[PDB]
Design a protein around this ligand. Sequence first.
Ligand SMILES: CCCCCCCCCCCCCCCC(=O)O
Ligand SMILES: CCCCCCCCCCCCCCCC(=O)O
Ligand SMILES: [Fe+3]
Ligand SMILES: [Fe+3]
Ligand SMILES: [Fe+3]
Ligand SMILES: [Fe+3]
Lengths: 285, 285
Amino acid sequence: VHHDGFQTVKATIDWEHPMFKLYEKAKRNGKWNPADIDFSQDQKDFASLTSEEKISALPLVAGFSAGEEAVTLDILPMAHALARQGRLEDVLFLTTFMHDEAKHVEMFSRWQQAVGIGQMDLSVFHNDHYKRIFYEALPEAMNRLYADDSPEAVIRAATVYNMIVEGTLAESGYYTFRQIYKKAGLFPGLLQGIDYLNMDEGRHIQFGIYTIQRIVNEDERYYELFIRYMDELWPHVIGYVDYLTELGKRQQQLARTYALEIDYDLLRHYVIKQFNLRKKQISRT
Amino acid sequence: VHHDGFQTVKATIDWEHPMFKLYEKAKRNGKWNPADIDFSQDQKDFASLTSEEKISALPLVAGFSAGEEAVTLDILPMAHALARQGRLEDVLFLTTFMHDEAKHVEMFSRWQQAVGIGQMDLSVFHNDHYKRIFYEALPEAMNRLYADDSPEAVIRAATVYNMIVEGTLAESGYYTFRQIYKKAGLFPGLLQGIDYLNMDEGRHIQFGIYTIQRIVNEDERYYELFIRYMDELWPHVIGYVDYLTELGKRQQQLARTYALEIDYDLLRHYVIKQFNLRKKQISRT
Ligand SMILES: CCCCCCCCCCCCCCCC(=O)O
Ligand SMILES: CCCCCCCCCCCCCCCC(=O)O
Ligand SMILES: [Fe+3]
Ligand SMILES: [Fe+3]
Ligand SMILES: [Fe+3]
Ligand SMILES: [Fe+3]
C-alpha cells in the first residue's frame, strides 16, 4: 500500500524523540566488528580440553547461536509494524538493532568455526522448553504484528522478545559466561564478544521498555497484560535454566579442572532476579 | 510461523557466500556518521543566496529525502522474504542496507534543519511521475513480497528498487549534485554526504544485481521480465527528469550567479546512460 507522504520532506526527524537519541547512541557505541576478534587463543583453549570438558561449553553456545539467529529474523515484523504506524525514529533505531543481532549471529558462528565445532549440530542442546520460547513463541508473537498491530500485540511482542529473550535469558547468559569462563581464563575472544553483545543488549532492552511503557501510558490496564505475558513464559524460562543446570551438574570435569566452584543455585537466582527487575522497569502509572 | 532450526546451530554462516562478503565490506566501509558532518558552511551558503537561488536546490533535495525515507521503509519486505527463504547471508547484508538508508534519511534531514528549511514542506516538488515511482510503484512491488515471493515478484522488487530507484535515479542524482554544487563550491557538508551515499549505493546496487542474476540464472526467461519491468518504469523516470530540468531552466539565477553552464542535455543523457548500463549488468545466460 502507498506512501501518503514523507516526514523528512514535510518536516524533519523528531530530533528529541527517545528512539532517535537511542539510534544516535547505537551509532556511536556500535562500531565493533566480530571479524576483528582474535579467536586464535580460543582455538588452542578448546583443543587443550578433554572431550568431557569440550562439551561443557556447548549447551550455552547452542542456546546463544539459535537465540541470535531467531531475533535477527524475528525483529523484522516489529520494524514493519512501527514503520506502518509512521514511527520513523523507531525504525531508524531498529536498523541498528537488526544490524547488532546480525553481528551477534556472526560472532558466535565465527567462534564455532574457529574452535573446530562448526560442523557439529548443536541442536541436541535445545530442550522442549527452549524450543517453546525460540522455535515457537517468539516467532508467533512477532509475526502476529504483520496482521495485528494492536497495543496488545505490540506489548506481547516486546515482552517476549525484549523483556524475556533479551532482558531475562540473554542477560543471564552473559552473567553465566563471565561467572564460568572469565574465572577459568578461557576463551578470551568469546568473552570479548560477550562484552560487546552485553553492551548492545542495553539498547535492545531499552527499546522494549520504551515500547511497553508508551502503551501502558495510554491505558494503565495494559500493565496487567505485560505482567501476564511475563508470567506465561516463566515456566519455560526456568525449565530451560533447570535443563542447563542439570547438564552442568552431570558434566563437572571442566569445573574441577579449572577450580570453578560453579554456583548453579546463584545462577538460578540471577535469572529470577533478572525476570523480576524487568517487571519493575515498567510502571503501571 | 515457527523456526524449524537454525543455520548457525546446525552448521555455520556460509563464509564464501557473495552476500556475506558484501556484508563484510559494508561493515568495513560503512562507519560514517551523518552526525559528524559539519554543515555550518552550508548554513552560511544557503543564507547568502537570494530567494530565487535558494529554491534552485530544493527540488533535488525533495526528491532525495522522500527517496531515502521510502527505501528505508520499503526494504523491510525484501528482508522478510529472503529471511523466510532461509537466505541468512542475504539477511545479514540487508541489515547494513537498511541501516545505510536510515543514515541517508538522517543526512538529508540534518542538512534541511541546518540550512533553515526543515519547516518547509518540500512535497510541492514531487510531480505525478515521481509519485508514481516512490509513493506507489516502489511500495507496491516491495509489499507484494509479503504474500508472493515468487521469482517473478523478487525480480520485479529488485528491478524497481535497486535498478531503477537506486541504479538509475539515485546515481544520476549524485552526478547532478556534483555537476552543479561541486562546481559552484557550495554546500560542502551536503557534498560530503553525497560522497558517502554514493559509496553505500554501490553495495545496494550490487545486491540487486546479485538477486536478479541468481533468478535469471535459474530460468533465462526471467531476463525478459527484467527488461520489461525496466522499460515499464522508464516513462516515469524520464518524466520526473524532464520535470526537474524544466524547473532548472525556469530558475537559472543560481546558475548565472555561480557561472555554471549547467548542461541539462548532458544530465539527461547520463540518466539514459545509467538506465541502459543497469540493463547490461544482467546477463541473459
Ligand atoms: C546455567 C545458568 C542459566 C543461564 C541462562 C542462559 C541462557 C542462554 C541464552 C540463550 C538465549 C540467547 C538470546 C539472545 C537474544 C539477543 O541476541 O537479543
Ligand atoms: C536534473 C537532472 C535529473 C537527475 C535525476 C535526479 C534524481 C533525484 C533522486 C531522487 C531519488 C533518490 C532515491 C534514493 C534511493 C536510495 O537512497 O537508495
Ligand atoms: Fe543479540
Ligand atoms: Fe538483543
Ligand atoms: Fe540511500
Ligand atoms: Fe540505496
